[PDB]
Design a binder for this molecule. Structure first.
Ligand SMILES: *[C@@H]1O[C@H](CO)[C@@H](O[C@@H]2O[C@H](CO)[C@@H](O)[C@H](O)[C@H]2NC(C)=O)[C@H](O)[C@H]1NC(C)=O
Ligand SMILES: *[C@@H]1O[C@H](CO)[C@@H](O[C@@H]2O[C@H](CO)[C@@H](O)[C@H](O)[C@H]2NC(C)=O)[C@H](O)[C@H]1NC(C)=O
Ligand SMILES: *[C@@H]1O[C@H](CO)[C@@H](O[C@@H]2O[C@H](CO)[C@@H](O)[C@H](O)[C@H]2NC(C)=O)[C@H](O)[C@H]1NC(C)=O
Ligand SMILES: *[C@@H]1O[C@H](CO)[C@@H](O[C@@H]2O[C@H](CO)[C@@H](O)[C@H](O)[C@H]2NC(C)=O)[C@H](O)[C@H]1NC(C)=O
Ligand SMILES: *[C@@H]1O[C@H](CO)[C@@H](O[C@@H]2O[C@H](CO)[C@@H](O)[C@H](O)[C@H]2NC(C)=O)[C@H](O)[C@H]1NC(C)=O
Ligand SMILES: *[C@@H]1O[C@H](CO)[C@@H](O[C@@H]2O[C@H](CO)[C@@H](O)[C@H](O)[C@H]2NC(C)=O)[C@H](O)[C@H]1NC(C)=O
Ligand SMILES: *[C@@H]1O[C@H](CO)[C@@H](O[C@@H]2O[C@H](CO)[C@@H](O)[C@H](O)[C@H]2NC(C)=O)[C@H](O)[C@H]1NC(C)=O
Ligand SMILES: *[C@@H]1O[C@H](CO)[C@@H](O[C@@H]2O[C@H](CO)[C@@H](O)[C@H](O)[C@H]2NC(C)=O)[C@H](O)[C@H]1NC(C)=O
Ligand SMILES: *[C@@H]1O[C@H](CO)[C@@H](O[C@@H]2O[C@H](CO)[C@@H](O)[C@H](O)[C@H]2NC(C)=O)[C@H](O)[C@H]1NC(C)=O
Ligand SMILES: *[C@@H]1O[C@H](CO)[C@@H](O)[C@H](O)[C@H]1NC(C)=O
Ligand SMILES: *[C@@H]1O[C@H](CO)[C@@H](O)[C@H](O)[C@H]1NC(C)=O
Ligand SMILES: *[C@@H]1O[C@H](CO)[C@@H](O)[C@H](O)[C@H]1NC(C)=O
Lengths: 162, 431, 197
């Protein structure tokens, strides 16, 4: 199953079919008329559903991965076509990752380019220094997994039972 | 093979070697951070458009769900790895408009305004030097997923880290960014490795020239060597190779009459077609499981490398590290992060002692029946006179009560030599 | 907050559930129940059906063991990191940056958690920074004075020496400065008096 586009490839007279580097057909010669056609498979995409928690809302957005918007609140991203989210020029922290610098959040569902950080310009000069005059004692949490559940499998009973 | 050039160290009980000069050495460390994110449609890859094949595939259960879940875990893991290595500052720092840092030149590592990508010349070189197969891989139901952080944003994070380190030293890593002049920052780093501030201040022009020359050499070395960026390219190669192998596996009969499902359906009745499709399904499923297993092992290796890269970014770039060989060869001074495709390159600026000279050494000096020991240095003799100098640079000073401390009598100490110890108070009271 | 530990628990349960789920798979056989296969077929064809079930179940079990081994390696790496943190953050003070919390590390406290450890990192964070005019050295009597442990700061009219991480201005004296060389060599040196005790 494929689209048959015009081909610029010059086949030798014996050759009938054409193959990719990976041994998949990319070209063919028509039997009725001796012309070369570029066989290209029909478009496919990975449908991804972007949703907030169900209790908060039931609105969803659909991302078609790798599919241009013209071949399927519609916005075009490098990741694919995003339908059901409205692009906002504002930048916020990432809530739901879409990819290619695009993130989604619920406020309706909006898509935006995520802000890396707040912008700070340090006042560097040849002869000025900044000295702390006070301190904060900060306690922070680090959570590390140490062990897993210990599992034993009876191979004979699992495969065969009694 | 020869292990090494042969050197015999001239050990003697009373001789020490003290460096009289230094070399500022910049070295490159290349670490892979992330891999290509791959997603596989299990049904499309194994069966394509065949309904009968999908129906037979359903009998095997949740293998497809397991493979998709594992790939999804790897895909999120790569983004997490990139966040851990690069997103370590919540403030995007910027360099001052006047790029004067006491004679230190950072043009090669700072972002270039002229370039559209806003990358440094070193970063641009790194991106250039790391590079219908893709179409076929896409056509077989395998999809490459874009990285969550784009290359420009990763470059922006590296720029923020560079701006923070250059303008603020290590303060920004541990808290609010506190501005410090770059020569004073370099002097602090010199103090960290045990060399006094005066050595940096007196030789500031020489140190700046050495650093600039080293940075230029680093750019030339990366540009002129094919195998400098081998590790990142290898990772890219493995991912492409794995996909190619998986695509190649579709052309395997797997003990069946044909590798084409459509031919099997067209030529055979369903009782034997089911057997042939079963053979194709089991072979393709085994191939897909094998691919996922290698991907998981590679993901673990890349995760370990990313964890190491994050540790280097925290300890070498955001701080000065006393760990030996962790942040370059030599005594570590500072580090600079540069973005690279699927990777980070660390420019380690280190202090290497050079032009060492022999001196006669003693553990202690005996004066007035008391043993004097150096507060911070070592006792050296040029043949006739005794001086005290800092261990990592030769700076002879007169032996005084100010720079020595008295513990015990001379007799208990072994190897003690007799020399005068000057008193600062003696001229003052005398005059 | 405790997502990581729960995730590990979730994976183990999920893996077992998947393995249990695999028992309900025909694997290309007439039935997924061995007892039905024995009850319905003669041994020459029952052997074939049992073989199909055995190969599918064995493949599932091998897949489960392979994922368990990879997860075990990941957990072992995490445990090694946790042991390193326990040795370096709890049993000692660490100079490594960001290893034991954000900021300058002071001390750490271990807390047990299911399948895990939680480290409470007590760190010192500088705050309320103030601008000052700074110089590399002070020129007095034709000699360059450098701080022994601090930095020279000026509030606008007077010069003092203070510790780098906290503002505590002190008079510039011979006690807290050392003399190396003449003033001329040092770039940016400023002229100020140095007190003598
Ligand atoms: C130290 O002084 C500099 C400049 O004298 C201050 O930097 C200014 O900060 C304000 C407030 O954020 C900005 O609007 C200016 O644009 C900054 N100037 C420059 C040249 O960057 C800095 O805030 C002072 N530091 C402290 C702790 O007061
Ligand atoms: C340093 O910061 C501490 C807080 O971190 C300040 O203590 C506060 O002082 C104000 C006014 O004196 C009180 O209203 C607060 O209740 C205090 N907070 C705490 C937690 O004690 C302290 O005054 C600051 N010191 C300087 C010199 O700025
Ligand atoms: C310090 O002195 C020692 C010995 O006085 C020097 O070691 C000699 O080095 C030369 C040249 O490499 C060798 O031919 C000798 O055999 C070495 N002698 C011994 C006893 O090992 C050493 O080179 C001197 N250090 C410096 C920096 O000149
Ligand atoms: C320490 O080494 C540096 C070079 O690493 C020396 O600087 C060189 O000095 C010579 C003669 O003065 C010049 O011809 C070179 O051009 C200098 N090189 C550089 C890179 O500036 C310096 O003289 C050495 N100092 C001592 C005391 O040995
Ligand atoms: C910092 O280094 C850069 C390059 O490392 C210097 O730029 C060079 O300037 C000279 C003189 O104008 C040119 O001939 C070169 O072509 C420049 N190199 C590049 C790569 O553009 C720069 O002058 C140095 N100094 C400062 C203050 O930026
Ligand atoms: C060891 O170092 C001392 C001090 O640098 C040298 O003493 C000086 O030597 C020079 C040249 O011989 C004289 O002009 C000075 O007057 C000496 N100073 C004093 C206080 O006597 C000494 O010569 C060096 N010894 C050797 C063997 O090089
Ligand atoms: C170091 O100095 C001490 C004290 O001046 C020396 O001890 C003297 O040695 C002489 C000759 O052996 C004796 O006549 C004195 O009676 C000793 N005095 C004491 C208090 O013991 C010692 O010999 C010197 N050592 C060296 C290596 O020169
Ligand atoms: C810089 O700090 C010094 C020391 O604190 C200040 O000198 C004192 O200032 C106070 C108030 O102006 C006077 O009451 C004292 O008599 C001063 N001491 C001396 C020894 O003169 C100085 O004023 C500060 N400068 C600025 C611009 O704030
Ligand atoms: C720091 O002090 C030195 C010496 O007191 C100053 O050098 C003098 O400068 C004046 C005016 O420029 C000259 O007339 C003298 O001949 C200089 N003497 C010497 C020994 O060099 C220097 O100018 C002072 N620097 C500052 C910034 O005030
Ligand atoms: C077949 O028919 C087409 C259409 O009439 C003609 O152009 C062509 O020359 C014929 N012969 C071959 C060998 O294709
Ligand atoms: C001091 O800094 C300013 C801007 O930061 C610069 O214009 C000036 O040239 C610097 N002074 C020297 C002596 O380089
Ligand atoms: C000093 O070293 C030499 C050989 O290096 C050795 O023979 C001698 O015994 C040593 N001196 C003492 C006092 O042990």
């Amino acid at each position: 199953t494929g689209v048959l586009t015009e081909s610029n490839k010059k086949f030798l007279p014996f050759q009938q079919f054409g193959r990719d580097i990976a041994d998949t057909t990319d070209a063919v010669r028509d039997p009725q008329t001796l012309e070369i056609l570029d066989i290209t498979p029909c478009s496919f995409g990975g449908v991804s559903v972007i949703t907030p928690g169900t209790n908060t809302s039931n609105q969803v957005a659909v991302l078609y991965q790798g599919v241009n918007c013209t071949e399927v609140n519609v916005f075009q991203t490098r990741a694919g076509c995003l339908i059901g989210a409205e692009y906002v020029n504002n930048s916020y922290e990432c809530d739901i990752p879409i990819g290619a610098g695009i993130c989604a959040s619920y406020q309706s569902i909006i898509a935006y380019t995520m802000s890396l950080g707040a912008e700070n310009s340090v006042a560097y000069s040849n002869n000025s220094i900044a000295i702390p005059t006070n301190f904060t004692i900060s306690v922070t949490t680090e959570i590390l997994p140490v062990s897993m559940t210990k599992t034993s499998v009876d191979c004979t009973m699992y495969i065969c039972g009694d | 093979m020869s292990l090494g050039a042969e050197n015999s160290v001239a050990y003697s009980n009373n001789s020490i070697a003290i460096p009289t000069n230094f070399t500022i050495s910049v070295t490159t460390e290349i670490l892979p951070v992330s891999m290509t994110k791959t997603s596989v449609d299990c049904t499309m890859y194994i069966c394509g458009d065949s309904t009968e094949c999908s129906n037979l595939l359903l009998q095997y259960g949740s293998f497809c769900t397991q493979l998709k879940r594992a790939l999804t875990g790897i895909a999120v893991e790569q983004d997490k790895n990139t966040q851990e290595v690069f997103a370590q500052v919540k403030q995007i720092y910027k360099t001052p408009p006047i790029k004067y840092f006491g004679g230190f030149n950072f043009s090669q590592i700072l972002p270039d305004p002229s370039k559209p990508s806003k990358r440094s010349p070193i970063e641009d070189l790194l991106f250039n030097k790391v590079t219908d197969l893709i179409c076929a891989q896409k056509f077989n139901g395998l999809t490459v997923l874009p990285p969550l952080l784009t290359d420009e944003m990763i470059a922006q994070y590296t720029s923020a880290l560079l701006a923070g380190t250059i303008t603020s030293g290590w303060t920004f890593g541990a808290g609010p960014a506190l501005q410090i002049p770059f020569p004073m920052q370099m002097a602090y780093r010199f103090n960290g490795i045990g060399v006094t501030q005066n050595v940096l201040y007196e030789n500031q022009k020489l140190i700046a020239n050495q650093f600039n020359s080293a940075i230029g050499k680093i750019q030339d070395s990366l540009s002129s060597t094919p195998s400098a960026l081998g590790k990142l390219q290898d990772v890219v190669n493995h991912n492409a190779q794995a996909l190619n192998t998986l695509v190649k596996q579709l052309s395997s009969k797997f003990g069946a009459i044909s590798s084409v499902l459509n031919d099997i359906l067209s030529r055979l009745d369903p009782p034997e077609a089911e057997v042939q499709i079963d053979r194709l399904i089991t072979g393709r499923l085994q191939s897909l499981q094998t691919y996922v297993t290698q991907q998981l092992i590679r993901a673990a290796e890349i995760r370990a490398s990313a964890n190491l890269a994050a540790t280097k970014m925290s300890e070498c770039v955001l701080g000065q590290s006393k760990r030996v060989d962790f942040c370059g060869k030599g005594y570590h001074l500072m580090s600079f992060p540069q973005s690279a495709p699927h990777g980070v390159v660390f420019l380690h600026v280190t202090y290497v002692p050079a032009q060492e000279k022999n001196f006669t050494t003693a553990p202690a000096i005996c004066h007035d029946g008391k043993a004097h020991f150096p507060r911070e240095g070592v006792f050296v003799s040029n043949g006739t006179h005794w001086f005290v100098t800092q261990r990592n640079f030769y700076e002879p000073q007169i032996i005084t009560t100010d720079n020595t401390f008295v513990s015990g009598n001379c007799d208990v100490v072994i190897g003690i030599v007799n020399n005068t110890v000057y008193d600062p108070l003696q001229p003052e009271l005398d005059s």
